Amino acid sequence: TAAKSALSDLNWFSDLADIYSGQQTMAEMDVALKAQGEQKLSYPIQGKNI
Amino acid sequence: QMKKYATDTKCLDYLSTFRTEVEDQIANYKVALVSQMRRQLTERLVEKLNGIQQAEKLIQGSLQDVMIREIVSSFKDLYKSRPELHDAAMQSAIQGLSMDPVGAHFKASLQELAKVNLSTATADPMGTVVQRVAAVFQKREKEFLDTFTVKATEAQEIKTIVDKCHKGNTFDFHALSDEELRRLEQLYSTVNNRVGFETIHENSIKPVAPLSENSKGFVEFVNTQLEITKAKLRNARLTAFAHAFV
Amino acid sequence: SWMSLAPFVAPNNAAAWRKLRDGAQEVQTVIERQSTPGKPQQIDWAKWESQIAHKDILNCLKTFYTNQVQILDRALGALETCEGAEKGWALFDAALSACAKSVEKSEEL
Amino acid sequence: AKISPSEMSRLLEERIAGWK
Amino acid sequence: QTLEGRYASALFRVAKKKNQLEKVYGDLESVRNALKDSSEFRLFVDSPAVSVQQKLDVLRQLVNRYKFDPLTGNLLTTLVENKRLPMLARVADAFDAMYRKEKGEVKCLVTSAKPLSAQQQKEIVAALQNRAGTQARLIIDYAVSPQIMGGLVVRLGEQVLDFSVATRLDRLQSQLLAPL
């Protein structure tokens, strides 16, 4: 019943996961503010655009 | 033995490198996401054009098929009806033993067809081969355009019943609506998925899962702000969908 | 280098770590992929304008394409030059200090 | 590709000539 | 080329020179009619338990009764000694076809119903200028699938000139369903 990792109770693996997911999402939603300027669109519609 | 645990000093450099790396492995993520969107858009358009080309091809195939079938049936009628073609064919063969009415009638109908503008024509069993073939032409073209274009009834419905009833000068927001707004969203997913546009689905974003209490002060600032971005973006989407339809 | 931080994990802190690990894997599975071919798609309308007979809806579709690619390249070159994240980098720094406070304990020996 | 009335019909008309 | 073809080519290429084959042609036609009208001579060559003695005697005496030529007798003795006499009528018809083919062909021909003496004349003169064969003895027929346009076969096998309505029509239709 030995113990590797002479270091004591580690409890900072959760926070790393949380900040990783947070930075990932914050990037994902600082992207789509830019990639959806959406000036105008051109939809082909029967009777009018055709 | 303790010659083992000398590794346990190197559990501190790793975290410095964590902070140094993740602020770069992320800056090389937004770029890849942009290019992902570009790739998906391009592939969507390409598949659309392959489909539309194939449809055009099969249309013209069926067109010439019927163009031949109907001329042939017309000739099979006219021959058995008319007396003159018999002796004309006799003379034709006789002089050929050293033009026939079949090639003549075919060429005549083709020449009379080449300058018809089949769009201006009439119903299916309408006698004249042009009236027999243009029915197929127009009907097939209608069954074509409804699948790689939007229909004017779908437009009129929302344009006159849904969008402008919200608001005018800009068509601002959408909380002023019934639950049937969700159906409009479904309607969105039809149009762009027949035309072949690629718009970002905001809901592909996923919020954070809390793990421990110490993180609570961060996650909320994300998730709250995420809503402030998720709904906002929604508006900047649908206004476009409206301002094509006014 | 921080990916070689596995063996200092304990089974009470495993799934979280695994989540983190798989999270990063997702990112990397994107990036290399979206830089391996580079740009082989690059469609050329000279072909399709000819091969198609309508040339009435094709034009608007192409217009949409060229209107979106401009804004994509815009955002791309724009990001290629805060406070919302420091609230978590503080958690990271606290964890750093804790791990040093533990390694010093296990450097007595 | 090509259009039916003005092109294909002319082509097919050009195609039919043949005997012997 | 065949067996009966062998005897045919033999007697033809041997007899064309001196025999005045037309004489042989007439004698063989007489023999063919005697065959078709006897029913014992047919039996006789079928008659397998007959002595070759009686056969040879019959033939030698038949020389002195009807018209006869020497090469005819040589051939008859040949088909006797080679045990190939029942092939006699077949080789006779082979020789008839051979000689009349040297001189003039007989051809099949089809219409819908009765044509006219005028276009009949036109048909025969056109087929003659096409053949350039001075002798042509034809057939008339009525098959209405090829609607009325005159289809036929000038009898040499590799020329069935299909001047018809339905045939040109179907060939054209199946042609112009081609892609582009």
Author numbering:
A (entry chain R): 84 to 133
B (entry chain B): 321 to 418, 424 to 571
C (entry chain A): 20 to 100, 107 to 134
D (entry chain C): 52 to 71
E (entry chain G): 73 to 252
Copied sentences from the primary study:
The peripheral stalk extends from the membrane-embedded part of Fo and attaches to the tip of F1, holding it stationary against the torque of the central stalk. In T. gondii the peripheral stalk is composed of subunit-b, d, ATPTG12 and OSCP. The attachment to F1 is mediated through OSCP, which adopts a fold conserved in prokaryotic and eukaryotic homologs. Subunit-b displays structural similarity with its bacterial, algal and mammalian counterparts, engaging in conserved interactions with the C-terminal domain of OSCP as observed in other structures. Compared to the yeast and mammalian ATP synthases, T. gondii displays an augmented peripheral stalk structure with extensions in subunit-b, subunit-d and the additional ATPTG12. Instead, the apicomplexan-conserved subunit ATPTG12 forms extensive interactions with subunit-b and d throughout the peripheral stalk structure. Interestingly, peripheral stalk subunit F6 (subunit h in yeast) is not found in T. gondii ATP synthase. Instead, the C-terminal extension of subunit-b, adopts a fold that structurally resembles subunit F6/h and provides supporting interactions with the long subunit-b helix. Both, the yeast subunit-h (on non-fermentable carbon sources) and the augmented T. gondii subunit-b are essential, suggesting a critical role in peripheral stalk assembly.
